[PDB]
Write a protein that binds this ligand. Structure first.
Ligand code: BEF
Ligand SMILES: [Mn+2]
Length: 128
């Protein structure tokens, strides 16, 4: 994919955001911003320019399922890639997110290779 693709990394834990951002850099992606919950995320997304969202689920203010659903329902950003990265491991969680339009889904804890693999799976599906 285009190495100037702008990512929004959303998680209420700064340690996780740091992990994801550093994995993105290793993969060649340096245009990366962070948000701390779904409301902060939507503020940055409204600010413009984003091409990919990586998001947690359990966050205050707006959780990642609501964030995903808001994005998919919004005409200005309905096809924006959203990769879920969450400790929610139950099949019903995965179903709710998949059905809500998740581009992909990774369960914490996760390896570097898994994130890379699932990002590349989304790129290939979208022809990025
Ligand atoms: F708090 Be997240 F769903 F890992
Ligand atoms: Mn969380």
């Amino acid at each position: 994919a285009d190495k100037e693709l702008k990512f929004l990394v959303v998680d209420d834990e700064s340690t996780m955001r740091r992990i994801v951002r550093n994995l993105l850099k290793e993969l060649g992606f340096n245009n990366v911003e962070e948000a701390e919950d779904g409301v902060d995320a939507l503020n940055k997304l409204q600010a413009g320019g984003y091409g990919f969202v990586i998001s947690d689920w359990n966050m205050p203010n707006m959780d990642g399922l609501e964030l995903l659903k808001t994005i998919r329902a919004d005409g200005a950003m309905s096809a924006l890639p959203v990769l879920m990265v969450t400790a929610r491991a139950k099949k019903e969680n995965i179903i709710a997110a998949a059905q809500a339009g998740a581009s992909g889904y990774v369960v914490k804890p996760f390896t570097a290779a898994t994130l890379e693999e699932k990002l590349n799976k989304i790129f290939e599906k979208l022809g990025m």
